[PDB]
Amino acid sequence: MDKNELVQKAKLAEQAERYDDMAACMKSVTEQGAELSNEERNLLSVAYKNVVGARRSSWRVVSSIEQKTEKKQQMAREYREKIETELRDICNDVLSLLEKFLIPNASQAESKVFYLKMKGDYYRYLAEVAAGDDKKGIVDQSQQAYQEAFEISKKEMQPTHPIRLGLALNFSVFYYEILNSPEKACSLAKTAFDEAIAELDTLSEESYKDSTLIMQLLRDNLTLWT
Amino acid sequence: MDKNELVQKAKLAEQAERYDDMAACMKSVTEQGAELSNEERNLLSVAYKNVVGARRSSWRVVSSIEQKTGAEKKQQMAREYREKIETELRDICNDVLSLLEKFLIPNASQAESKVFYLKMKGDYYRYLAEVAAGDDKKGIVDQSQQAYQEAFEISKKEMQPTHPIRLGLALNFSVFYYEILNSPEKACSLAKTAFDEAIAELDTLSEESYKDSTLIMQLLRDNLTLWTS
Amino acid sequence: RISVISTGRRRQSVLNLMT
Ligand SMILES: OC[C@H]1O[C@@](CO)(O[C@H]2O[C@H](CO)[C@@H](O)[C@H](O)[C@H]2O)[C@@H](O)[C@@H]1O
Ligand SMILES: OC[C@H]1O[C@@](CO)(O[C@H]2O[C@H](CO)[C@@H](O)[C@H](O)[C@H]2O)[C@@H](O)[C@@H]1O
Ligand SMILES: [Cl-]
Ligand SMILES: [Cl-]
Ligand SMILES: [Cl-]
Ligand SMILES: [Cl-]
């Protein structure tokens, strides 16, 4: 099927709020092997964010129920495990597209950082529901993806670039929430915040529309965290 | 599974906003063949309301797009997507209408429940009518109208004018007239009569009955305002 | 608690829920 046709179906599914249909369209587009346009990259990202987001939300609700309760406490646990399997399938789906197509084909630093951050993110979602033995290997794969994104963005992007900022934000959250290491989390977010404000003290105009709001997120975590 | 396991799973799914799961649980409960309690009936109704509601909303978005697009391969795409959604919608409605026929309506032991399930039959045939075209449409519309009319006669004979289900039937039956039969005059007459007969007895009600009845009385009032302005 | 993704009067009908 024509790529432009799949794309127009993705947009139709989006307007109808059928995000599984939307993801299936952009997955087929990705599998055609050509590098994604900016528009296509956004549609793919938005589709899977909603798909995986519904499961994460369900998982948090059912976990909270499971905690606040012996026959009912076990029914919840087996439901939670049903949700976890959907979630893992979605994450593995995305991570496979990233590995097989998106990351090796990315010919620009901006796209490459975007996809590596996305890899960090989806391994983080796997770590959110990982248990015991497997968790440490998941957590390491998330961190290595973020770190690789981080090194590229430091060399190739302005400190106020929204993707660089969004990376520092999510990577800092990972340190805090997943690695429980706010000393590393605070340091990274602080360094990222400080570099962005040094740039804005120099230039007269913000180069990107969303820079300052993401900078605010960084400082608020910096103030909330130590 | 036994009934209580299914009911608790339905409640979990509801909390998790997983309405397809919720509906499957309550469908299984219904299929065990015992008359549903008010709580089980509510879980069933809420589940399918959400499951069919998502399709109805999607359908209206995609229908609108299909109708507002200088034809192209674009219009055909929207048409085909619309048809994919319609099929989901019809399957959902046929499932509900089958439960009503085989279990819910036959097992209803009280006038209140009987009116509730006949109104529900009217509603889900109405949803089929929203999406029906040509040959099939008249038949579907008649099935909706006959369910509502039967609900209406029983409620008139057996229920107080302020009963929320009698009021809610009048509301949805008036919407059927307005929107499916394109008969505004009958829609407004139906709705106004139900409203007026309810105010005439509002002094009977307790503090709690009053709140139940007045919520639906407001809906009748506001539909009327919308349709006569 | 917040993570970010970067981008480059209808008529009423009623369902009765009797307690
Ligand atoms: O919601 C995840 C769940 O959906 C299923 C179908 O029931 O698979 C769909 O989603 C997967 C993850 O995105 C896709 O890989 C698959 O192609 C799609 O059909 C389940 O297999 C999965 O657990
Ligand atoms: O959403 C309706 C659509 O879903 C499918 C599965 O793809 O069936 C599900 O929903 C039906 C309607 O409630 C159920 O009867 C069925 O058991 C359930 O799997 C399609 O068959 C249907 O068109
Ligand atoms: Cl494009
Ligand atoms: Cl079931
Ligand atoms: Cl019960
Ligand atoms: Cl009033």
* In contact, A225 and A186? CB cutoff 8 Å: yes
Residues of chain B contacting A, Cβ within 8 Å: 5, 8-9, 12-13, 15-18, 54, 57-58, 61-62, 65, 73-74, 77-78, 81, 85
C5 with A163: Cβ contact below 8 A: no
- In degrees, rounded to 5, the angle at the alpha carbon of residue A118 between the alpha carbons of residues A98 and A90 is 65
The candidate with the shortest Cα–Cα distance to A192, out of A222, A171, A220, A168, is A168
Q: How far is C15 from chain A (nearest CA, A)?
A: 23
Q: B150 burial class (0-12, 13-18, 19+ CB within 10 angstroms)?
A: middle
- Measured in degrees and rounded to the nearest 5, phi and psi for residue A224 equal -65, -55
d(CA B48, CA B56): 12
A93: its two tokens: 């789906």
Q: Which residues contact B35 (CB under 8 A, 6 or more apart)?
A: B107, B108, B109, B113
A13 with B81: Cβ contact below 8 A: yes
Runs of H (alpha helix) within chain A: 3-15, 19-31, 38-67, 72-97, 103-105, 109-128, 135-156, 162-173, 182-202, 211-224
Ligand 1 atom 5: residue of nearest CA: A86
- The method of structure determination was X-ray
Q: Which residues contact A11 (CB under 8 A, 6 or more apart)?
A: A43
Q: B19 burial class (0-12, 13-18, 19+ CB within 10 angstroms)?
A: buried
Count up the domains in chain A and report the number. 1
Residue of chain C whose Cα is closest to the Cα of B225: C11
Q: Report chain B residues whose CB lies below 8 A from the CB of C18.
A: 38, 41-42, 112, 116, 164-165
Q: A1 burial class (0-12, 13-18, 19+ CB within 10 angstroms)?
A: exposed
Domain holding A102: CATH number? 1.20.190.20
Q: What is the DSSP letter of A35?
A: P
- In degrees, rounded to 5, the angle at the alpha carbon of residue A67 between the alpha carbons of residues A62 and A69 is 105
Ligand 2 atom 20: residue of nearest CA: B88
The candidate with the shortest Cα–Cα distance to B93, out of B42, B144, B43, B151, is B144
d(CA B19, CA B55): 12
- Measured in degrees and rounded to the nearest 5, phi and psi for residue A211 equal -55, -55
Residue by residue, DSSP assigns A75-100 as HHHHHHHHHHHHHHHHHHHHHHHIII
Q: How far is B184 from chain C (nearest CA, A)?
A: 13
- Measured in degrees and rounded to the nearest 5, phi and psi for residue A123 equal -70, -30
d(CA B67, CA B84): 16
* In contact, A79 and A62? CB cutoff 8 Å: yes
Centre a 10 Å sphere on the Cβ of residue A3 and count the other Cβ atoms it contains.
Answer: 14
Q: What is the dihedral of CA B88, B93, B99, B105, to 10 degrees?
A: 180
Q: Which residues contact B72 (CB under 8 A, 6 or more apart)?
A: none
d(CA B150, CA A119): 59
Closest ligand 2 atom to Cα of B48: 13
Centre a 10 Å sphere on the Cβ of residue A122 and count the other Cβ atoms it contains.
Answer: 24
Q: B184 burial class (0-12, 13-18, 19+ CB within 10 angstroms)?
A: middle
Q: Report chain B residues whose CB lies below 8 A from the CB of A9.
A: 77, 81
Q: Report chain A residues whose CB lies below 8 A from the CB of B78.
A: 12
- In degrees, rounded to 5, the angle at the alpha carbon of residue B23 between the alpha carbons of residues B22 and B25 is 70
Q: B23 burial class (0-12, 13-18, 19+ CB within 10 angstroms)?
A: buried
Q: Which residues contact B218 (CB under 8 A, 6 or more apart)?
A: none
d(CA B19, CA B47): 5
- A106 three-state secondary structure: coil
The candidate with the shortest Cα–Cα distance to B173, out of B151, B195, B140, is B151
A192: its two tokens: 């990222």
A27: its two tokens: 């997955």
Which domain does A17 fall in, by range?
Answer: 1-226
Q: A198 burial class (0-12, 13-18, 19+ CB within 10 angstroms)?
A: exposed
Ligand 2 probe mutation, B21, B89, B91, B97, most atoms within 8 A of CB: B91
The candidate with the shortest Cα–Cα distance to B4, out of A181, A117, A72, is A72
Closest ligand 1 atom to Cα of A94: 13
Q: What is the DSSP letter of C11?
A: P
Closest ligand 1 atom to Cα of A55: 1
Distance of alpha carbon B212 from the chain centroid? 18
The tokens 């975590």 sit on which residue?
A221
Q: What is the DSSP letter of A74?
A: H
- A7 three-state secondary structure: helix
The tokens 């509730």 sit on which residue?
B116
d(CA B100, CA A109): 59
d(CA A7, CA A10): 5
B90: its two tokens: 């019809």
Q: How far is A62 from chain B (nearest CA, A)?
A: 6
The tokens 């970010």 sit on which residue?
C4
d(CA B72, CA B69): 8
Specified resolution (Å): 2.1
C11: its two tokens: 């008529």
Residue of chain A whose Cα is closest to the Cα of B61: A16
Half-sphere exposure of B38 (CA within 13 A, CB side): 7
Q: Which residues contact B184 (CB under 8 A, 6 or more apart)?
A: B177, B178, B227
Question: Which sign, positive or negative, has the C-alpha torsion B66, A25, A164, A178?
Answer: positive
B222 with C12: Cβ contact below 8 A: yes
State the best of A3, A57, A58 to mutate against chain B, taking most chain B CBs within 10 Å.
Answer: A58
Q: Which ligand is the nearest neighbour of the Cα of B27?
A: 4
Greatest Cα pair distance, chain C, in angstroms, is 50
Centre a 10 Å sphere on the Cβ of residue B193 and count the other Cβ atoms it contains.
Answer: 14
* In contact, B172 and B129? CB cutoff 8 Å: no
Ligand 2 atom 22: residue of nearest CA: B88
Q: Which ligand is the nearest neighbour of the Cα of B91?
A: 2
Angle between helices A72-97 and A38-67 (to 10 degrees): 160
Q: How far is B64 from chain A (nearest CA, A)?
A: 11
Closest ligand 2 atom to Cα of B24: 17
Distance of alpha carbon B197 from the chain centroid? 23
Q: Which ligand is the nearest neighbour of the Cα of B22?
A: 4
In this complex, which of B12, B16, B62 lies closest to A16 when CB atoms are compared?
Answer: B62
**Three-state DSSP string of chain B:** CCHHHHHHHHHHHHHCCCHHHHHHHHHHHHHCCCCCCHHHHHHHHHHHHHHHHHHHHHHHHHHHHHHCCCCCHHHHHHHHHHHHHHHHHHHHHHHHHHHHHHHHHHHCCCHHHHHHHHHHHHHHHHHHHHHCCCHHHHHHHHHHHHHHHHHHHHHHHHCCCCCHHHHHHHHHHHHHHHHCCCCHHHHHHHHHHHHHHHHCCCCCCCHHHHHHHHHHHHHHHHHHHHHHC
* In contact, B125 and B169? CB cutoff 8 Å: no
**Where do breaks (C to N over 2.5 Å) occur in chain A, by preceding residue number?**
69, 225
Q: Which residues contact A93 (CB under 8 A, 6 or more apart)?
A: A27, A48
* In contact, A56 and A128? CB cutoff 8 Å: yes
- Measured in degrees and rounded to the nearest 5, phi and psi for residue A161 equal -60, 125
Radius of gyration of chain A (CA): 19
Centre a 10 Å sphere on the Cβ of residue A74 and count the other Cβ atoms it contains.
Answer: 11
d(CA A120, CA A174): 9
